[PDB]
């Protein structure tokens with residue numbers, strides 16, 4: 001197995017996947033690495049299994065159909081994996097914890113949002129459809145773009161949104177378009 005966390009790329013107290021060489025800090029894996037379970041399979045492996053069981057799940061889908069899906073166990077897992085893929089980028093640090101807003105010429109957003117809040121919301125089964133999860137994720141980046149206006153720091157929101165959107169299209173097998 002790897003000797004660094006797949007998510008944050010640091011060593012430490014690591015839990016090793018039994019079916020692939022990845023390793024994880026306890027609270028870097030989503031969901032948090034389970035207490036017992038021998039063997040244990042990581043989220044990457046669990047997602048691969050879904051695909052392998054239903055090859056047709058990789059045919060193209062419309063975004064509007066995906067968003068309306070209820071959060072049954074497979075869709076719960078897919079959103080946990082998509083959230084984890086965002087944390088995998090180091091620029092997620094900017095969006096992880098609760099933001100505050102005090103900048104001359106700007107007003108903070110009406111509905112602040114951050115990654116750890118989405119993480120808690122998934123853990124607590126607060127989303128009933130994929131749409132709820134995707135709306136809160138996109139809100140993170142939209143709040144950032146609006147607040148930072150023409151400061152070059154706005155780009156960090158474009159960058160992490162692009163990681164989110166690419167991973168959304170991959171995980172949920174969104175139909176490719178030009």
Ligand SMILES: [Zn+2]
Pocket residue numbers: 005006007008009010024025028
């Ligand atoms: Zn880690």
Ligand SMILES: [Zn+2]
Pocket residue numbers: 017018019020021022041042043044045
């Ligand atoms: Zn694995």
Ligand SMILES: [Zn+2]
Pocket residue numbers: 053054055056057
């Ligand atoms: Zn099938």
